[PDB]
């Protein structure tokens, strides 16, 4: 995030971190929508131009985190993936149209003060809120500068 500020503890309990098993590195962000499902972008898993094409066993999901680097004992939960679903019509060839993917956690995750699911919008919430000028919030452990 460029020009952002540090999140408060528990300010975004659904933020998930996609972590590569080896090299151990941060791949992407994601979000928790239920005790067993994580929503992320399909380009995080499949992007042929850059030879990217990850499978369940290549990843780990870290839930309840604040620190980018640290293994936060007693706070974060790390889960393994059972199945990855990429939208059938995800367009990587041209414009990343329908850039979405669902990941099934191998075992349901327990909620706490730091882990809690976000709501998915319904037609009426979407209509009233997705309007020009309205502010939304983005969160991540990514780059602070393009440069």
């Amino acid at each position: 995030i460029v020009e952002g500020s540090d999140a408060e503890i528990g300010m975004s309990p659904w933020q998930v971190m996609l972590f590569r098993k080896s090299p151990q590195e941060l791949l992407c962000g994601a979000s928790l929508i239920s005790d067993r499902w994580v929503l992320t972008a399909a380009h995080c898993l499949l992007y042929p131009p850059w030879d990217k094409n990850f499978t369940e066993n290549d990843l780990l999901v870290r839930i309840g985190k604040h620190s980018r680097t640290r293994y936060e004992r007693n706070i974060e939960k790390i889960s393994m993936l059972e199945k990855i679903y990429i939208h059938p019509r995800y367009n990587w060839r041209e414009n990343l149209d329908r850039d979405i993917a669902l990941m099934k956690l191998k075992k349901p995750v327990a909620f706490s003060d730091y882990i809690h699911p976000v709501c998915l919008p319904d037609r009426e919430t979407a209509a009233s809120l997705l309007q020009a000028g309205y502010k939304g919030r983005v969160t991540g452990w990514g780059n602070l500068k393009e440069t």
């Binding site: 151990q24 590195e25 980018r68 680097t69 640290r70 293994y71 790390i78």
Partner: peptide
């Protein structure tokens, strides 16, 4: 960079 899990 990351702490060992």
């Amino acid at each position: 960079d990351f702490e060992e899990i």
